[PDB]
């Protein structure tokens, strides 16, 4: 479990989160929340550190993650932003949790801290 091998598995996890099979619930998370289109103008009063898969993929491609756990922190931040902002019963929370189930299932293969 070198850091290279771990970062390689994190790239595979991200590819899986962006894969076609999950599009039906992952699409709200591909790009920054479109606050202006949706009219969610209190979003930035609640969420001070936005994150989305496109941002994570740009960081991964730029070699910006030093280890698997910094990658995990950014992925989990994207999900926590959704859970912090949206009502727990909301449809986008259901979609977020489905995408998180994909992440957590695969991230379970990464050695602990
Ligand atoms: C404090 C507050 O007002 N909460 C709140 C929020 C909602 N939410 C929506 O109405 C909504 C509709 C379509 C939406 C979203 C949210 C999001 C979204 C937003 C943020 C994050 N982080 C991730 C995602 C995927 N994407 N799409 C396509 C409704 C009622 C309340 C009271």
Numbering used by the authors: 266 to 378
Could you share sentences copied from the article?
BRDT is a tissue-restricted BET subfamily member expressed in pachytene spermatocytes, diplotene spermatocytes, and round spermatids. Based on proof-of-principle knockout and in vivo chemical biology studies, BRDT is a validated germ cell target for small-molecule contraceptives. Deletions of either BD1 or both BD1 and BD2 in the mouse BRDT gene result in male sterility, indicating that BRDT is a testis-specific target for male contraception. Our drug discovery campaign on BRDT, a validated spermatogenic-specific contraceptive target, yielded rapid discovery of potent and specific inhibitors of the second bromodomain of BRDT that have unique binding characteristics to BRDT-BD2 relative to BRDT-BD1.
Interestingly, truncation from CDD-1102 to compound 20 (herein called CDD-1302) showed no loss in activity despite the loss of >100 g/mol molecular weight. Optimization studies led to identification of CDD-1302 with similar potency, selectivity, and metabolic stability with significantly reduced molecular weight and less hydrogen bond donors. The BRDT-BD2/CDD-1102 crystal contained two molecules per asymmetric unit, whereas the BRDT-BD2/CDD-1302 crystal contained four. The overall structure of four molecules in the BRDT-BD2/CDD-1302 crystal was nearly identical except for a short segment of the ZA loop (residues 305 to 308). In two of the BRDT-BD2/CDD-1302 complexes in the crystal (molecules A and B), an arginine residue (R341) from the neighboring molecule in the crystal interacted with N307 and the bound CDD-1302 through hydrogen bonds. This caused a segment of the ZA loop to move away slightly from the core. Last, the other two molecules showed an additional CDD-1302 bound at a previously unobserved site near the BC loop. The additional CDD-1302 molecules bound at molecules C and D showed several contacts with other protein molecules in the asymmetric unit mediated through Jeffamine ED-2000 and ordered waters. These contacts suggested that the different ZA loop conformations and the second CDD-1302 binding were caused by crystal packing. The BRDT-BD2/CDD-1302 complex revealed that CDD-1302 binds similarly to CDD-1102 excluding the contacts with the missing methyl benzamide ring. As mentioned, a segment of the ZA loop containing H306 and N307 moves away slightly, and this allows the side chain of N307 to move closer to CDD-1302 for a new hydrogen bond with the terminal amide oxygen.
